[PDB]
Design a protein around this ligand. Structure first.
Ligand code: O4S
Ligand code: O3V
Ligand code: O3V
Ligand code: MG
Ligand code: MG
Lengths: 335, 337, 339
């Protein structure tokens, strides 16, 4: 709980209203009650701010006339919302102190104020930086290193020789460092190629739940600083992802793809390997990426939904489009 | 547990034709059935095949009965009766029995009657587990979460904090409920985390497959209606709402703030955009590319299916250049007219 | 782990050119290799670059040998020799060693010789673990399941009940074998669960990646043949049958009751519908949308690739209206036919 004046100061916002108001938490505009701070970005909500029951509303200067409550004026309400939600965050920590049921190899090196949850398993040679938090049921494999401030939720699996930077966050069920999909072929028989590269994860990386990031075959899979990766993603061996790139849920990336900085990969896209995508590329959802991308911009693929009766005709005509093409050429020749 | 055929027929509301004293030990497919097994016939083309089935009894319709070569249970709906008798004769174990000494249970957790918790499961402060709840081995249930009576988690399920799960739910292994939604503000190209302080509310009789992820809401909640069934490896983003009785097949990806109505059917591997609505009674066939809201009930589809690679090469190239084909068509129309 | 180059050459059946007494300590890429490392060359474009490689030895072909600037192992197939030498020099640790005191093992479980069970793993009643089986930390192995000799599970793998796994398999973390198939009946508008009482049978030498799910069958079994390799995030539905030596790349979804033959290659993110068969020696390229049976071997493909968004918008609009284009083409043909 925090006085509105003090909150406004920490957000570098201009206060319009009683600075003595006590703010206890953040809420959506439709759910906000007395004690809550909320925000608005869409001008459509201006007309009904009189129905919002928040104690304060983060808004722009052009919104201030429509205010029906204390208001904090800022240039970017959504970014200010991110910041105030962090000040008023209620999320608990994955663990506190070291649980007696945790199994920690005696050669593990632990920094100051490391927390390890119940039944977590820490292997030999592991290094955990200051303030690292390991959730219940996690596994951290041999000689892996987790930088200061990084946090793993429950039931995360980190394999051996993995490097994670500072202030990272990994959600439950994620697996970092499994074998890449590497095999030779000896007369129809698959021959396993041991995958003895690593994963290097930079600083301030956030990884979602049930995402898999494979280790490299010889050299490393590399995740840049500030990257965010959603749930159910697959990052194959020797993929390199540049700083501040965002990957939405269910994206599948094949081996040895290189993605630049500040990219945005829409959910359920499929990115083929041994190719590069330059900085500042957006791929919209379900994008089928087969070729390198060398110019920044927005790229898309796929034929959208239709009523089933219509789709049947659309698909049949497309599958026979070579015959249409030939008939068009014949007609041009005749005319 | 074995049961007399007459007693089984009674519990199934079926007309017994044959020896009610036969002892049934389990359910089997028609081709696999042996003595002591009960099976079922849904396809009347197998009528001439019943003499090759070695089951002790067969569920069938009244029209099938003249063709029987075994004791028969006559019902209106053999498939539904099979579902029911397989529940009566189910061999599936429970995820746990009693409370394992290796489980780690906070002193403030509130356990109802007849709760079972498997080895090395971890139960946080404030958790409430209703009567007859079963938590499998290695699960994690986070702070203040509530799981209603009769619900069951298989092994290695993760439930985060402040999650509400209804009665008689079933969650398969590897599933994660309540992780942070994909919420970040952009500050000059750097991502700023938005804490996700909403929850997940799961209704009654919900079934969730393995390695599915259901994220908590940003402020308000992600909501799963009653009777919903969700298959393996689906992604349900923050603040998605799924209406009662909707079925979501395997591998479906949903973006944030999608609302799906009641009684929908979402085919496997579909991809659904966020911040929009799908009305009641919508079916999307598999691999559907759902970009826009769906405002009318019925069946919807997308995608260009497989061809021989040599053929696909031409199809893909021609579609990619379809604007040029369109212009050539227009030009030829003008030249002819 | 270190080995004399001469001894390594013998084990690889390679012709040594250079000092057999060199001590090799590991494998590395050409770019990263240092003293004590062995590397390999598959692309003759790097011949002019070998003076920059600081490996102690390089695996190459006879045609490469005049370009060597180091000890060389000459072979017919550098890529396969690389696979074999990486196994000889593998640094990958085991998922576990010995039986962890924190493991929870039912009294009726049967263990063979030299079994290792990692910390906090849970082994149910009736489970059978063969000789040299390794179960990683945090695994669950359900009632009456059987894991054959030499098979290994990494950490946090879940095996349900009545599952059978053969010899020398390897399963990566987060994978779930034997969950309920997606089976339900309909009672006047309510879903009714169909208990899934079939099993999963996994053959010998199967490798399964991470966070893959393989559901048990409804009555009869889900079957994975010998030598099959399956990547991460795959979904194998109830009653799927996969034939020997087939490869399934990452993120593939297979619907119920699909049968896939032998020596198939299923590209990443493909979607294969059910109640149908794919014959032997079929390749489906990435993101393939498989709606019909495949009865002839060969390569099959689907999907319209990426374009710039403004171009895509026009492509998509024209395709969605292709029925009107077809009607206009037929009308024009009639006019040109003088009808
Ligand atoms: C890195 C984050 C990010 C990358 C790219 C974009 C570009 N915007 C889109 O691609 C919008 N979009 C669609 O048009 C259609 C395409 C056909 C399939 C269904 N559908 C989509 C499915 C999932 C997502 C998705 O993952 N999102 C949307 C909210 C945030 C994540 C988006 C979409 C936006 C955001
Ligand atoms: C719920 C039910 C008892 C009935 C049902 O309708 C259904 C079922 N199983 C499915 N598997 N797949 C699937 C899975 C993987 C890849 C491709 C497809 C579907 O699309 C499925 C559907 C649906 C069809 C159309 C909309 S939902 C079982
Ligand atoms: C099994 C093998 C040793 C050889 C192989 O054939 C193969 C391999 N790795 C792959 N990754 N992806 C992939 C992954 C993610 C997104 C898109 C594509 C494929 O499609 C892959 C394929 C195949 C190509 C065509 C059919 S299978 C390695
Ligand atoms: Mg997918
Ligand atoms: Mg323990």
């Amino acid at each position: 709980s925090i006085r509105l004046a003090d909150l406004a100061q920490q957000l570098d916002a201009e206060l319009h209203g009683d600075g003595d108001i006590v703010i206890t938490g953040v809420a959506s505009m439709q759910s906000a009650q007395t004690g809550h701070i909320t925000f608005m970005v869409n001008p459509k909500y201006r007309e009904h701010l009189g129905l919002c029951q928040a104690s304060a509303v983060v808004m722009t200067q052009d919104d201030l006339p429509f205010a029906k409550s204390a208001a904090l004026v800022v240039k970017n309400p959504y970014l200010t919302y991110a910041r105030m939600a962090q000040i008023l965050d209620t999320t608990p920590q994955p663990a506190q102190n070291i649980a007696p049921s945790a199994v920690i190899d005696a050669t593990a090196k632990l920094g100051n104020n490391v927390s390890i949850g119940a039944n977590a398993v820490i292997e030999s040679g592991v290094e955990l930086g200051d303030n690292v938090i390991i959730g219940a049921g996690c596994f951290v494999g041999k000689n892996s290193k987790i930088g200061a401030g990084s946090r793993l939720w429950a039931n995360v699996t980190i394999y051996h020789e993995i490097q994670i930077g500072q202030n990272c966050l990994i959600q439950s069920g994620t697996v970092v460092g499994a074998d890449g999909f590497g095999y030779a072929n000896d007369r129809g028989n698959w021959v396993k190629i041991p995958q003895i590269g690593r994963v290097i994860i930079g600083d301030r990386v956030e990884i979602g739940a049930c995402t898999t990031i494979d280790r490299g075959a010889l050299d490393d899979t590399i995740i840049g600083n500030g990257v965010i990766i959603d749930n159910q993603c697959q990052i194959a061996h020797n993929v390199v992802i540049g700083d501040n790139t965002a990957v939405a849920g269910g994206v599948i990336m094949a081996g040895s793809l290189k993605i630049g900085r500040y990219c945005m990969i829409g959910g359920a896209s499929v990115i083929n390997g041994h190719m590069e995508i330059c900085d500042k590329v957006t791929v919209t959802g379900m994008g089928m990426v087969m070729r390198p991308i060398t110019e920044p911009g927005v790229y898309s693929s796929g034929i959208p939904l239709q009523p089933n009766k219509v789709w049947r005709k659309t698909a049949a005509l497309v599958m026979n489009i070579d015959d249409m093409s030939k008939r068009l050429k014949s007609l041009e020749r005749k005319v």
